[PDB]
Sequence to fold (130 residues):
Amino acid sequence: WEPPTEAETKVLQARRERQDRISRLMGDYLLRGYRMLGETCADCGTILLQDKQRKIYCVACQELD
Amino acid sequence: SWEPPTEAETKVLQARRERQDRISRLMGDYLLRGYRMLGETCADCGTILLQDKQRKIYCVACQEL
Ligand SMILES: [Zn+2]
Ligand SMILES: [Zn+2]
Fold:
């Protein structure tokens, strides 16, 4: 052990907050009526949602970044 | 019409949320136990990568979940 760097602690806390936000958005859109698909985003790994027969949506890529 | 989320969906959501919480907890622990964060995400799953003290690269999601 040496202590994690301050960099590593910020990135870990960021990564935490991000994932929390992604779960919260996915939940929001499921509640708003979006369909969960059995596929994940090829870019970021996030489970994909579908809005009727209008579109497929990644809450990460297409909203949070 | 709008339709609720299904039993399936809200299960997968709770699961994804648990996964992500565990990834963060695992990542943190490895950081505190001597593993250094890489500026790079797992190509399979998107998770930030670590290296151990023998410079093996290590994805907590892939190689422990
Ligand atoms: Zn994505
Ligand atoms: Zn991985």
User: Anything to note?
Assistant: The helical segments of chain A are 6-31, 60-64.
